[PDB]
């Protein structure tokens, strides 16, 4: 639907979709799209209001310029930031390990005050990383992604608390700007106020107010209504402006002689000097909105004007009096209520744009205080604009952000959906925000405002639940950073089509309708009443007159990864969350078959994932080949697409790609041309459809274990590809320079039958565990060999050498062909790190079959390892002779409340056999509603079932009584949906009909080849003699504490001591036991370790004489 060449996936839905899904990747591209300032965003935020737009960079320069020294004799100004064209295209930048950027130019001008000059000079600011078409960045060849961050928005926050002593209500306020000072207006258990600005112990409201230039009469005039401040003024003890101004200054410093500076300069240099205290363009808006200030205004400023303060002051006193509304001279009346910190109306989302703008600003705040410092001590009249601009700090800051920053993460891409959902993520943790251990379980809970903005289902299971969430489908980011959602406004019970994006603030004030309401052909609520969501957040019920807004469609709450689970409204939240988190972990198979029964988010989430080569302009195919395709547009110029074949992903998967068109086909703009890793015909296909039964089979699938058939191994139905990358480097050492050469110290000649004449192996060599990949050799140095060895070299006429055999050998348990070999050299201009003459990398491919130990999983969160793989001949086979493929257990279905995975098992069979409603005289009651043209479907037909609007419990049962016979008229699955299986092992049939169907399962990326480990004796750390391993090093297992407790509970002293002494640290013990073992003698009885003759020395180093008696 609304896609040129998409497949025809029948749908079970009943409602319409007035609004179609947005540009899922918009939150990254159209969000970036504001630092550069491309005309695209110009028109976007110029047609929908936005009187005057200013780019992300321009908004920095226009706050930096004009550079002015303290002498006031000269000035520097910046303007017109523009970008050139990129140097190297994406692909090349991904291959040569060079960062994908473009040049940045800013017009700079210096002017003198004595006489003045008009020197304008285009200053090159440096390289700037650009955002690829998919929304990711390329840094040093690695594809990284920036993740938006949730942060409470600067502004005014009120609140109230109860004291246990007297049990009254104390109403506090706070004003939190970006890079400023905080001043809570507390209201103590007693009176009167909590003026304690900048956290200095307190102050009285009349002090700061009067010090602002207020007569003691005006205070009682405005704020007397409102008598609680009468006591504040009475007990203030101070009369006059400076009489309390110098007291404020005292409490601030303290301990310094008061003056006229310490009285007025301070106050005017903490709130009204827009260089040390400035609340960003957002705060200046959240404050006006909260209070009833200039709100109707193009207003643009960052100084906390006196007025605002006074307002909030009385606001506070009005709160702890008992009232609802508040007004101010000339201001729009606002309601009085304590704000909530977690409400999605006070929690903005700094996207990838503001994070880069912040880094650019922090850099400018280093490159800025380098001109005005080299502006006085330079030769005046001899300086040119470029002579002052030391750009280096800015590029350094940028590179220090895109690297080593905990918000720039390697794009988790082992399949299209994992990549798509790595973007659109919002993590409340990270820099500038809260932490993971210092944030109580309040920011984790789901708030009734998250409906439509953040999905409540999708979230990690580890110690991050609630801290890392994902955007919804229809949501959209405001120009400030607040998340919006589209509603349809209904006027007088007549549902219209005027879509209106509401934020989180202006949603509670109104009344929101429900998605699935009985509208009758016009927009009239058939029934007299309707469900609603009132301000507070409760679920009320109202008449069909107050309803003004209504959701555009169900599944608004659901994210993208979640909107692909069929029958979601039948699964529990735990299992639904596990299913949503176990899809971004699947692996791309070799065939990539589409799912038989999914939802509408398949076709519309692959073309947006950025791994499906989409025809750009409607043309006609001219030539196709596994390597590339060419389209001949209707207007002359053609265009050649280059599909990437067998490219390694970041997690080791395969990035294959293959055309899906012929040499004559006509194509239109948007249509799919080449499939992706996990796509099929241009739509997500993460796994395969397998015939599954639901019986427990003789104890091989016990407690989540799964058994398979050999067919899935013979017919390459779950075979996957994996490409690993090994790397070695040859540097210069103290004795010389390491050389990568075919020559080697004492070694055989059968371990060189695959290395080319110059070391590195030849492409196509079937390597295995232990073999050699790169021939390296390092200078030995100089030593002196004992007799036994000199009398041995003489015998074998092999004079010794001065090199060590330190090559690059394949790690343990790894095989497969050698695909690619990359080589960089300092002698060949191939830039590399310091002290590195050469650097080689070797890619090894491997086709992994399914094997017991590999984890599998369906969409509904059900998972399990593969325990047994029976031959194809002993497996419960239907009456025809078709063996079931997988055999799931029953005891896992009921107690986990995921009966969803059963419904799709039933439907999965229907859509596999194909039905035809027998309504040739009249549509049966059960199926007189759902669609038309869905009363019959050819065998092996595709279908769809939207998340909360799909098939119905009473419809499957109607689609299960029409299951046309396979070849000879013989219905195999009776009405209830159960077959009569024959026991392939014993021969006779099972005594009860068993449930069978077609389930869509996926092979996760937790294969045993990754987990299996072992270590007999490896390398040990030098400082601490405990075992240690790395890439090609075993590593050693960790015998923790509770294990020692268990050992002691057994009373096994010798085993514990052995695990503690001759296996971890005792160097004289490990070798003395290894020698015994290898010689076949008795293991020496564990004595007292040598780690006890070191405690005595460490004590005696303190003048403590400890003696063993």
């Amino acid at each position: 639907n609304s896609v040129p060449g998409a497949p025809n996936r029948v749908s079970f839905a009943k409602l319409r979709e007035p609004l179609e899904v947005p540009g899922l990747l918009d939150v990254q591209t159209d969000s970036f799209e504001w630092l550069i300032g491309s005309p695209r965003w110009r028109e976007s935020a110029a047609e929908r209001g936005d009187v005057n737009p200013v780019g992300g960079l321009e908004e920095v320069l226009y706050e930096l310029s004009p550079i002015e020294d303290f002498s006031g004799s000269m000035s520097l100004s910046f303007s017109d930031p523009r970008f050139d064209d990129v140097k190297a295209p994406v692909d090349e930048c991904k291959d040569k390990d060079m960062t994908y950027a473009a040049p940045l130019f800013v017009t700079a001008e210096f002017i003198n005050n004595n006489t003045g000059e008009i020197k304008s000079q285009t200053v090159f600011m440096g390289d700037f990383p650009m955002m690829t078409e998919k929304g990711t960045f390329i840094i040093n060849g690695t594809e990284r992604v920036v993740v938006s961050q949730l942060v409470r928005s600067p502004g005014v926050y009120f609140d109230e608390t109860i004291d246990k002593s007297t049990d009254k209500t104390l109403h506090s306020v706070k004003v939190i700007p970006s890079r400023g000072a905080w001043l809570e207006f507390d209201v103590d258990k007693r009176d009167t106020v909590g003026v304690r600005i900048d956290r200095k112990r307190r102050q009285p409201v009349t002090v700061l107010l009067k010090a602002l230039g207020w007569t003691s009469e005006q205070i009682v005039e405005r704020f007397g209504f409102s008598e609680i401040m009468r006591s504040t003024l009475e007990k203030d003890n101070t009369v006059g402006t400076d009489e309390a101004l110098l007291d404020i200054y005292r409490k601030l410093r303290p301990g310094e002689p008061p003056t006229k500076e310490s009285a007025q300069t301070l106050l005017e240099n903490l709130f009204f000097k827009e260089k040390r205290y400035d609340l960003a363009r957002v705060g200046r808006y959240k404050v006006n909105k909260k209070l009833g200030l200039h709100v109707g205004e193009p207003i643009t400023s960052s100084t906390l004007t006196e007025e605002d303060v006074v307002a909030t002051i009385e606001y506070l006193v009005r709160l702890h009096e008992g009232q609802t509304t508040m007004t101010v001279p000339g201001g729009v009346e606002v309601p009085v209520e304590t704000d909530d910190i977690d409400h999605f109306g006070n929690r903005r989302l700094r996207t990838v744009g503001e994070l880069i703008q912040n880094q650019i600003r922090v850099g400018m705040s280093r490159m800025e205080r380098v001109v005005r410092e080299r502006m006085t001590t330079q030769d005046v009249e001899a300086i040119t604009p470029q002579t002052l601009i030391n750009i280096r700090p800015v590029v350094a800051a940028i590179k220090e952000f895109f690297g080593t920053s905990q918000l720039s993460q390697f794009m988790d891409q082992n399949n299209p959906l994992s990549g798509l959902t790595h973007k659109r993520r919002l993590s409340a943790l990270g820099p500038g925000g809260l932490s993971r251990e210092r944030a109580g379980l309040e920011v984790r809970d789901v708030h009734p405002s998250h409906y439509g903005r953040m999905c409540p289902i999708e979230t990690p299971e580890g110690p991050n639940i609630g801290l890392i969430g994902s955007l919804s489908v229809y949501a959209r980011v405001n120009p400030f950073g607040f998340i919006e959602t589209p509603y349809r406004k209904v006027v007088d019970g007549v549902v219209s089509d005027e879509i209106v994006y509401l934020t989180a603030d202006e949603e509670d004030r109104h009344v929101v309708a429900q998605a699935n309401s009985p509208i009758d052909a016009d927009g009239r609520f058939v029934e007299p009443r309707v469900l609603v969501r009132r301000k507070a957040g409760e679920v009320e019920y109202v008449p069909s007159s107050e309803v003004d807004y209504m959701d555009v469609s169900p599944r608004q709450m659901v994210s993208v990864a979640t909107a692909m689970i069929p029958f979601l409204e039948h699964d529990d939240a735990n299992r639904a969350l596990m299913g949503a988190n176990m899809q971004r972990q699947a692996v791309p198979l070799v065939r990539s078959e589409a799912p038989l029964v999914g939802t509408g988010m398949e076709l519309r989430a692959a073309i947006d994932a950025g791994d499906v080569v989409v025809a750009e302009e409607s043309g006609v195919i001219e030539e196709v080949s596994a390597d590339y395709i060419t389209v001949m547009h209707d207007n002359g110029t053609r265009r050649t697409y280059r599909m990437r074949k067998f490219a390694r992903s970041n997690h080791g998967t395969c990035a294959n790609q293959c055309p899906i068109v012929d040499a004559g086909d006509r194509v239109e703009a948007g249509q799919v041309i080449a499939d992706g890793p996990c796509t099929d015909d241009g739509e997500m296909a993460l796994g395969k459809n397998l015939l599954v039964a639901i019986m427990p089979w003789e104890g091989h699938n016990y407690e989540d274990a799964i058994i398979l058939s050999n067919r899935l191994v013979e017919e390459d139905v779950l075979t996957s590809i994996h490409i690993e990358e090994h790397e070695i480097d040859a540097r210069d050492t103290k004795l010389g320079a390491e050389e990568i050469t075919r020559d080697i110290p004492n070694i055989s000649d059968e371990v060189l039958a695959d290395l080319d004449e110059r070391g590195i192996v030849r492409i196509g060599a079937e390597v295995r565990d232990g073999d050699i990949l790169v021939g390296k050799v390092t200078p030995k140095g100089e030593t002196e060999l004992t007799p036994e060895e000199r009398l041995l070299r003489a015998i074998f006429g092999e004079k010794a050498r001065e090199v060590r055999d330190t090559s690059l050998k394949v790690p343990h348990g790894e095989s497969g062909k050698v695909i690619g070999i990359r080589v960089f050299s300092r002698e060949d201009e191939d830039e590399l790190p310091a002290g590195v003459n050469e650097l080689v990398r070797v890619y090894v491919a491997q086709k992994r079959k399914i094997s017991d130990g590999d984890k599998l999983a369906g969409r509904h969160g059900n998972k399990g390892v593969i325990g047994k793989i029976l031959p194809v001949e002993d497996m419960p086979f239907l009456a025809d002779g078709t063996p079931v493929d997988i055999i799931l257990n029953t005891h896992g279905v009921p107690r986990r409340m995921n009966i969803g995975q059963i419904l799709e098992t039933h439907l999965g069979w229907c859509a596999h056999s194909g039905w035809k409603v027998d309504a040739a005289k009249g549509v049966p009651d059960w199926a007189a509603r759902l669609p038309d043209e869905l009363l019959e479907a050819q065998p092996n037909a595709i279908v769809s079932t939207p998340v909360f609007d799909g098939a119905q419990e009473a419809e499957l049962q109607g689609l299960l009584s029409c299951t046309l016979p396979n070849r000879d008229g013989d219905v195999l699955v009776d009405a209830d949906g159960k077959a009569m299986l024959f026991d392939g092992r014993s021969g006779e049939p099972f005594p009860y009909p068993v449930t069978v169907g077609y389930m869509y399962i996926m092979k996760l990326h937790h294969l045993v080849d990754d987990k299996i480990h072992a270590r007999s004796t490896g390398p040990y750390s030098m400082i601490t003699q405990q075992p240690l391993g790395g890439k090609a090093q075993f590593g050693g297992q960790r015998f923790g504490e509770m294990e020692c407790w268990a050992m002691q509970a057994y009373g096994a002293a010798y085993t514990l001591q052995e695990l503690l002494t001759i296996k971890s640290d005792d160097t004289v013990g490990r070798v003395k036991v290894y020698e015994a073992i290898v010689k076949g003698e008795n293991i020496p009885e564990p004595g007292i370790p040598e780690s006890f003759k070191v405690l005595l020395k460490e004590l005696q180093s303190l003048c403590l004489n400890v003696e063993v008696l």
């Binding site: 103590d188 112990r201 307190r202 102050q203 504040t232 007990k235 203030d236 003890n237």
Partner: peptide
């Protein structure tokens, strides 16, 4: 009487610790 609280009890300890550190 807007003297909040704990200002004296905190300042006497701060000054005492500062005097100790200067004595060191």
């Amino acid at each position: 009487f807007v003297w909040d609280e704990d200002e004296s009890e905190a300042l006497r300890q701060a000054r005492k610790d500062a005097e100790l550190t200067a004595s060191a």
